[PDB]
Design a protein around this nucleic acid. Structure first.
Ligand SMILES: [Mg+2]
Ligand SMILES: [Mg+2]
Ligand SMILES: [Mg+2]
Ligand SMILES: [Mg+2]
Ligand SMILES: [Mg+2]
Ligand SMILES: [Mg+2]
Ligand SMILES: [Mg+2]
Ligand SMILES: [Mg+2]
Ligand SMILES: [Mg+2]
Ligand SMILES: [Mg+2]
Ligand SMILES: [Mg+2]
Ligand SMILES: [Mg+2]
Ligand SMILES: [Mg+2]
Ligand SMILES: [Zn+2]
Lengths: 130, 143, 242, 78, 132, 283
RNA sequence: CGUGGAGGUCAGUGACGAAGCCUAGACCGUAAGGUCGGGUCGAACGGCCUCUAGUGCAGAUCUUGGUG
RNA sequence: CACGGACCAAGGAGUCUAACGUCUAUGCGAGUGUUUGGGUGUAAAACCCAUACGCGUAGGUUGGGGCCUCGCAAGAGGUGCACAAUCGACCGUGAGUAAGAGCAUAGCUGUUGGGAGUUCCUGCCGAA
């Protein structure tokens, strides 16, 4: 049913979709790795999916499988990426072993950017402590 | 590999453009007098010695005659006159492009003066500058 | 703990891709060998055509000289090929010439094409005499046109003739495997002239570099204007246009 | 006279001289949709946003490293 | 004629996608033919009754062929004896479906036929009479 | 395409008893028919619509109620619910107090959707504000009951929640704004009675001369079918998927010797022979 | 592209200033226009998917008030 | 430049509705349409039953898209949708039969009609 769901979401109301002036579309979905409404992008469209998303200081990895499509409360499995960037990429590749290259590449890029953002918000909010 | 590639790096396509040695204009020949059209010594007559690998002609005043030292000059900014001197007397092997990055000039100048003496009035020609007078039309003017 | 196992579909895909790659490599080697043999064949055909052309020209000249020596006139065979070029704009054209112009594949000014000479085709040119200029094309002009402005019709997509393989893939059925083979089929009236000529896209020619000659174009060639049958002098015009 | 022949190239269309496509932003959540596309896109705060929200949007944008097209608007003039 | 079905039906579009992919990637002209048929309008998709299926199978050597109807199949009470075959078509009326199931036959969608016969092997296409 | 759903007690604990899915949820999900019927029926508050088409649209909406992705697409906060289609114990039908029903909804996990609907209330923008349409708010969960035992009165007051009998389900209530996938909660009795109301594979629908629609395509997912195992055996080798550019620029043979030799090999030999400048015998 | 009507939706926007109007300012679009900035304004309204209504001028008979 | 010009403010050249038909989409299918009434109804609604009538039903051969075998391919064939071609049988000389497709809804839209000046921007196809 993923194709049907995607086609309805495409030619009907993807509520998280925002139509930019260029004509490109952006899904507002927080779990979305690539914030662009496409076949590979909407977590709604695709049963198999993954994302790096920041919670507190941690940069967790969220996993989505067709097996837990029912029971959406427990759908997203939460994995802690190690603070070491190399270890984090290794863990992402391991968990995303035998996993389509699109989500893996996008997940790695999102982890890099979130790490940079965490570094730079530490920068902007440096305090006298320590 | 300490940073994963943000966005992507578009590799440039391989270029089928191999550099080849320059083919100089026919008039330029070793031992040919030259007129410089720009730079510090614009409008000053100089001798041509050899063509360098990096396409910069090498020229001597001689500094003895006209005070122009050994120097690199671009070919396109130069006019070639029909009068010649024999350059066989001067050997001009040692100095090269990388060398440019007094005694040598003296060694060159002695040999070049030796040939300059034979032709009448050439030293005076090299000493004096060149300029366009009124009524001078370059296109007819045979250089 | 336990190792993960490769998906059972990716393994099938890897097997299929490996076999396909091996097949493609074998086909590539065979194609390379065939290309070498094809180039050898093309060289032989070109040499044969060159000798044929030279001998034909010398034979015509010698026939003229011999006829003059004998005191008898020599008459050349009527030219079996013409080249036509469009001279006039589409507007202010009656229906009768307009329909003919479509048949000759001329749809814009300055375009031109080769036409076989026959009683049927000659009257068509007679119908469109005001709006076109045509004449007998020499070998050199045809060669230059085919090399510079040659375009091939491949699924109605005006493909440029930049390689012998392109012409082969279309015209090997008719025994034409190179640009020069096509040029021979054009310069002569071969058994497959219609198909080879139709394969060529109508030529798109610039206005002549030197000029049109006479100040006013729109009179017939003898009257002193561009359009009309000018015979060999078309070669002078087309080379200026091409 | 306007006509299709004047149309701009697709690769350069909808591009500011800074090289960033303008994207309207209302709140922090909409800002976060442009987290990584900092090179391709630049945010533009909407006209109807209150001054109190604009400073928060600017702070979050600086943290994310996303270029804002109209900062110092309603916090400064012109 | 058409380059895509004028209908906005999701499932017809999915079938068109599958069949255009097969026609692109299959040498068999069967996929091309069915792809072109899928675009047709209602007037250009006349119903092919179970009656016509019975005649098409009575033709020699076609008894074991898979009958294909790009469209709908309608029942015909005129007949008492109907042979067993695995008809394939877009839609099946309740009467036609019951007749096919009763006689030991079976009805499949065109996707199931594509899975069965990607090259259309042993297939027999039929088209209804478009008198009006 | 599960076999069964697990009932959930009002307090929240999962109930052992399980109910097979009805055949409605395995029905065509057609946005176009639902959209057309929804426009025609919403014009009434008149346009005639075929009864069978109307039932088809109702069935499509009911099927959409089970696809959690579509429910997220419309906007409901179904992110935290025990499962979909969401089923609750029949005792729900016998609640008499609004507060108890709301607490049961919190246990069910529809708290987020109710909070959304509560926050969304705003004043009507248009002049219709003074024509008895003044406050506008988002839509909440739908509670389906087989029989009313006071649940209807309890849930009337809470914003966003609308209740509908199983025998009387409405496309407007099921698919607001022609958008498929409204969040619904089914009582345990309602889930069972859905079979009788609409029918299963071997059960009459209870509607005179009605059968659930057939699927034009037996499989929803085209990726599974197109990949398959046998098609790839049937399929010729693929292309690059990004066409290699051939002949970006035209190189005139007359001016560039390399391409001239490429077009004609005999040109090389002829150049050496200089047959063009050959001398005919003086004779 | 623009103007209203209705349903749905953005847990949209708002005295730290909503809607309306102007803006020989900046950006975008080939253009109808759109976004932002500023001014004005001073309490609520907008974006988006769908169906439904619905784009600016010319000129005449003259009329009325008012002014010669 | 050639030809005309009291002044300011405004206002400023007719209406709803019907009949037949082509095409497209959807539902069903030798059927199809309900609402003519009733039930039911967080209540014009929505959901459901009948109640009728409307419009439907009451072979020879050649070619033929397609599919099968042989063939690397061209072909050799085999088989034959729609439909055509002629050849005829029967019913009653055609609209023929010898294996039907229509009904309903919506959109666009041609004609006939009942009182009955220019035309937001861009693009496209195109007589004479
Ligand atoms: Mg492959
Ligand atoms: Mg000139
Ligand atoms: Mg030239
Ligand atoms: Mg503003
Ligand atoms: Mg009809
Ligand atoms: Mg037979
Ligand atoms: Mg690829
Ligand atoms: Mg090109
Ligand atoms: Mg609204
Ligand atoms: Mg404005
Ligand atoms: Mg511009
Ligand atoms: Mg027959
Ligand atoms: Mg036959
Ligand atoms: Zn989306």
């Amino acid at each position: 049913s993923d194709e049907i769901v995607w086609q309805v979401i495409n030619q009907s109301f993807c509520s998280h979709r925002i139509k930019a002036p260029n004509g490109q579309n952006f899904c507002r979905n927080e779990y979305n790795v690539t914030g662009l409404c496409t076949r590979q992008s909407c977590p709604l469209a695709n049963s198999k999916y993954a994302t790096v998303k920041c919670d507190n200081g941690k940069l967790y990895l969220y996993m989505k499988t067709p097996e837990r499509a029912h029971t959406p409360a427990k759908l997203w499995e939460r994995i802690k990426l190690s603070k070491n960037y190399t270890k984090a990429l290794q863990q992402i590749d391991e968990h995303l072993l035998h996993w389509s290259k699109f989500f893996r590449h996008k997940c790695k890029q999102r982890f890099t950017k979130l790490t940079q953002v965490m570094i730079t918000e530490r920068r902007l909010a440096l305090r006298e402590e320590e | 590999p300490k940073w994963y590639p943000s966005e992507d790096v578009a590799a440039l396509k391989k270029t089928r453009k191999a550099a080849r040695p320059q083919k100089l204009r026919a008039s330029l020949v070793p031992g040919t007098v030259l007129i410089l059209l720009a730079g510090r010594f614009r409008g000053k007559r100089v001798v041509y010695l050899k063509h360098l690998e990096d396409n910069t002609l090498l020229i001597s005043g001689p500094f003895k005659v006209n005070g122009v030292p050994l120097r690199r000059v671009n070919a396109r900014y130069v006019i070639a006159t029909s009068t010649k001197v024999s350059v066989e007397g001067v050997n001009v092997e040692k100095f090269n492009v990388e060398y440019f990055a007094v005694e040598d000039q003296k060694v060159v100048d002695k040999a070049l003066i030796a040939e300059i003496k034979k032709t009448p009035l050439l030293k005076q020609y090299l000493s004096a500058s060149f300029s366009l007078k009124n009524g001078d039309k370059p296109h007819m003017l045979k250089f | 703990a336990e190792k993960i196992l490769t998906p059972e579909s990716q393994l099938k895909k890897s097997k299929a891709q490996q076999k396909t790659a091996e097949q493609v490599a074998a086909e590539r080697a065979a194609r390379k060998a065939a290309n070498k043999e094809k180039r050898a064949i093309i060289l032989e055909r070109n040499a044969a055509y060159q000798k044929e052309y030279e001998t034909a020209e010398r034979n015509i000249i010698q026939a003229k000289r011999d006829a003059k020596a004998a005191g008898s006139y020599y008459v050349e065979a009527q030219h079996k090929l013409v080249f036509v070029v469009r001279i006039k704009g589409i507007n202010k054209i009656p229906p009768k010439p307009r329909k003919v112009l479509q048949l000759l594949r001329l749809t814009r000014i300055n375009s031109g094409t080769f036409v076989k000479v026959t009683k049927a085709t000659l009257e068509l040119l007679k119908l469109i005499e005001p709006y076109v200029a045509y004449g007998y094309p020499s070998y050199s002009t045809i060669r230059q046109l085919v090399y510079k402005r040659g375009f091939g019709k491949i699924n109605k997509q005006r493909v440029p003739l930049s390689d012998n393989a392109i012409i082969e893939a279309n015209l090997g059925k008719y025994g034409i495997l190179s640009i020069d083979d096509l040029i021979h089929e054009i310069i002569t009236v071969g058994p497959h002239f219609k198909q080879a000529n139709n394969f060529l896209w109508p030529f798109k020619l610039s206005n002549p570099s030197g000029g049109w000659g006479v100040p006013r174009k729109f009179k017939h060639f003898i009257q002193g204007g561009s359009f009309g049958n000018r015979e060999e002098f078309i070669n002078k015009l087309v080379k200026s246009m091409n | 006279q306007p006509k299709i022949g004047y149309g701009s190239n697709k690769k350069t269309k909808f591009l500011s001289p800074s090289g960033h496509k303008t994207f309207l932003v209302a709140n922090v959540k909409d800002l976060e949709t442009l987290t990584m596309h900092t090179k391709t896109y630049a945010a533009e705060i909407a006209h109807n946003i209150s001054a109190k929200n604009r400073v928060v949007i600017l702070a979050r944008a600086k943290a994310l490293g996303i270029k804002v097209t109209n900062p110092k608007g309603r916090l400064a003039l012109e | 004629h058409r380059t895509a079905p004028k209908s906005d039906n999701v499932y017809l579009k999915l079938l068109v996608k599958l069949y255009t992919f097969l026609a692109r990637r299959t040498d068999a002209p069967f996929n091309k033919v069915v792809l072109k048929a899928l675009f047709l309008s209602k007037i250009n998709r006349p119903p092919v009754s179970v009656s016509r299926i019975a005649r098409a199978l009575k033709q020699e050597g076609a008894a074991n062929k898979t009958v294909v109807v790009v469209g709908t199949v309608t029942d015909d009470a005129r007949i008492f004896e109907f042979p067993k075959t695995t008809v394939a078509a877009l839609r099946f009326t309740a009467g036609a479906r019951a007749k096919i199931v009763k006689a030991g036959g079976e009805c499949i969608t065109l996707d199931q036929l594509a899975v069965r016969a990607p090259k259309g092997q042993n297939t027999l296409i039929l088209r209804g009479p478009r008198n009006s | 395409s599960r076999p069964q759903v697990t009932v959930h007690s009002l307090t929240g604990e999962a109930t052992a008893n399980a109910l097979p899915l009805p055949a409605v949820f395995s029905a065509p999900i057609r946005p176009d028919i639902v959209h057309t019927v929804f426009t025609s029926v919403n014009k009434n508050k008149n346009v005639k619509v075929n009864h069978n088409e109307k039932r088809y649209a109702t069935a499509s909406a009911i099927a959409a109620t089970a696809v959690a992705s579509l429910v997220l697409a419309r906007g409901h906060r179904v992110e935290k619910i025990p499962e979909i289609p969401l089923v609750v114990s029949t005792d729900l039908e016998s609640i008499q107090k609004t507060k108890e029903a709301v607490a049961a909804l919190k246990a069910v996990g529809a708290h987020s959707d109710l909070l959304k609907v509560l926050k969304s209330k705003k004043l009507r923008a248009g002049k219709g504000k003074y024509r008895n349409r003044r406050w506008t708010q988002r839509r909440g969960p739908l509670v389906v009951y087989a029989e009313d035992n006071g649940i209807v009165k309890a849930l009337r007051n809470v914003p966003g929640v609308e209740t509908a009998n199983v025998a009387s389900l409405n496309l407007l209530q099921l698919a607001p704004g022609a958008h498929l996938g409204r969040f619904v909660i089914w009582t345990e009795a309602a889930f069972t009675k859905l079979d009788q109301v609409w029918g299963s594979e071997t059960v009459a629908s209870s509607k005179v001369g009605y059968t659930l629609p057939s699927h034009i395509i037996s499989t929803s997912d085209v990726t599974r079918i197109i990949n398959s195992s046998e098609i790839q055996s049937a399929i010729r080798p693929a292309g690059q998927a990004t066409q290699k550019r051939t002949h970006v620029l035209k190189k005139n043979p007359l001016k560039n010797k390399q391409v001239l030799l490429r077009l004609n090999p005999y040109a090389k030999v002829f150049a050496a022979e200089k047959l063009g400048s050959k001398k005919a015998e003086k004779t």
